[PDB]
């Protein structure tokens, strides 16, 4: 629009027509500059065939190279900022709920029990893979709390990355998945009791309180002389539950999860 509007303005001077091959030649050398950079981005895009974050990293490389000319830097900045404000909005729409939508797989992360979000090597953000691993694990923890219920909100009311600061914005992304860990660590400590689950398994599984087991070891000397028959494993669960309450377990729903291998 800015290119076509100068051509019409000098046509008002064409009805008073005295303009030169030289006065025109000066205005076209700035606007060959605007068009040659745009052509050389377009020529690279025909040879490239990239899309998504692979386009975002190509445009991030053009912010490095086109420095030294101020006005070639300003469009290559603006082309990167206009390619990232879609992309980091697809980031933010994956952070508040976990809405993965793919018109042509703009974002990298594809939907998989599985835990298979697996970033892609096809695409990479404007930064290196460290922020891609940081946002991948963000989507893994918000999907854990989403499995319980739909309750999380991003800590800002609006997430912006279309600003010259971008490395301080992936560090406010990292303090966000740390908080998602903390509300998962919340959900461990309130209802789930991870510490009591590891206490009820592990050192008790090596053997911690043998009075549960020496009662059961009285009943490994009468039965366990031959391999198991068809009526033997029905008795073995009857003896585990017998040896539960003769030695006074303190929490019964943490010890009924024991099953018996054939």
């Amino acid at each position: 629009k800015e290119y076509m509007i100068l051509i019409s303005q000098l046509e008002h001077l064409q009805r008073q027509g005295l303009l030169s091959l030289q006065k025109l030649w000066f205005y076209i050398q700035p606007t060959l500059r605007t068009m040659e950079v745009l052509a050389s981005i377009a020529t690279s895009l025909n040879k490239g065939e990239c899309f998504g974050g692979a386009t975002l990293s190509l445009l991030h490389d053009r912010t490095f190279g086109y420095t030294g000319d101020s006005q070639a830097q300003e469009l290559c900045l603006y082309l990167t900022k206009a390619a990232s404000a879609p992309y980091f909005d697809i980031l933010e729409r994956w952070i508040y709920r976990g809405i993965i939508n793919d018109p042509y797989s703009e974002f990298m992360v594809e939907e998989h029990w599985d835990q298979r979000y697996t970033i892609v090597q096809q695409q990479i953000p404007s930064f290196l893979q460290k922020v891609a691993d940081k946002i991948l694990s963000t989507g893994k923890y918000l999907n854990v709390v989403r499995e319980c219920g739909h309750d999380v909100t991003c800590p800002d009311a609006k997430e912006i990355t279309y600003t010259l600061k971008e490395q301080a914005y992936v560090e406010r992304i990292e303090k966000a998945y740390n908080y998602a860990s903390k509300v998962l660590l919340d959900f461990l400590m309130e209802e789930e009791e991870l510490v009591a689950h590891l206490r009820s398994i592990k050192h008790y599984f090596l053997m911690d309180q043998g009075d549960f087991f020496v009662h059961f070891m009285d009943l490994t000397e009468e039965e366990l002389k031959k391999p198991v028959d068809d009526i033997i494993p029905t008795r073995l669960e009857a003896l585990l539950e017998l040896a539960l309450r003769m030695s006074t377990a303190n929490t019964d729903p943490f010890k009924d999860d024991l099953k018996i291998e054939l």
Binding site: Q16, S20, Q22, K23, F26, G68, D69, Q167
Partner: protein, 232 residues
């Protein structure tokens, strides 16, 4: 100047400064053409058409483009660093007729150079392809730190507005800013205010202070060198 734009066409090759110098060379090429358009409006009917009056209307571009022929005769190459020693040798001449015009180029040849600098003070994410700055960042394979110098300063491309003690100074800040990344901290030193300053400086430069501030640019980096050190 037309053949210089024909040789300008690169992706961005062997220097970020080299086509930045031709970008301004397209801006001062641009100014010659507005002086051609005011001549063609003389030609048709809508003054007298003698040569002796357009001679002195081209004699004022004759002081303009001839001192651009000295700027194109200095540099055949497009590698930065030696371009910064070229325009600083042209501003040491007096007579602020073209000295204002080479200060335009001095403020713009430096503008890729100092854009390497203050971000490497502030965040330190290396962005070299052909080492347009005199500090070539990571040309040696990554090793654990035994106080080995990976950032050499390379005398062949030192800018003439950066003296000898400031060339070693920005190495001393740039070596410490990388040592605080592998300290199990990604925190920019002691505050998030080291981001704030970079943004303020970049807008200020964008609308204001076009001439380089080589006396004042060395002041607040020393007021950056002291805070990144004690936080470390």
């Amino acid at each position: 100047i037309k053949k210089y734009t024909d040789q300008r066409s690169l992706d961005r090759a062997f220097g970020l400064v080299g086509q930045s110098f031709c970008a301004a060379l397209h801006q001062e090429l641009k100014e010659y053409y507005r002086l051609l358009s005011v001549l063609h409006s003389q030609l048709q009917v809508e003054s007298s058409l003698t040569l002796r009056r357009l001679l002195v209307w081209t004699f004022d571009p004759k002081i303009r483009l001839k001192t651009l022929a000295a700027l194109v005769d200095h540099c055949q190459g497009r590698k930065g660093g030696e371009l910064a020693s070229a325009v600083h040798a042209y501003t040491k001449t007096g007579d602020p007729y073209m000295r204002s015009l080479v200060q335009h180029i001095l403020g713009l040849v430096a503008y890729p150079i100092l854009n390497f600098l203050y971000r490497w003070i502030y965040d330190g994410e290396l962005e070299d392809t052909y080492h347009e700055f005199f500090v070539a960042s990571d040309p040696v394979v990554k090793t654990d730190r035994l106080w080995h110098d990976k950032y050499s300063l390379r005398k062949s491309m030192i800018p003439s507005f950066m003296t000898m003690d400031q060339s070693r100074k920005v190495l001393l800040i740039g070596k410490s800013i990388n040592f605080l990344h592998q300290v199990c901290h990604d925190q920019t030193p002691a505050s998030k205010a080291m981001a704030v300053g970079k943004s303020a400086e970049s807008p200020k430069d964008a609308a204001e202070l076009f001439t380089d501030l080589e006396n004042a640019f060395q002041t607040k980096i020393d007021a950056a060198y002291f805070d990144t050190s004690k936080y470390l």
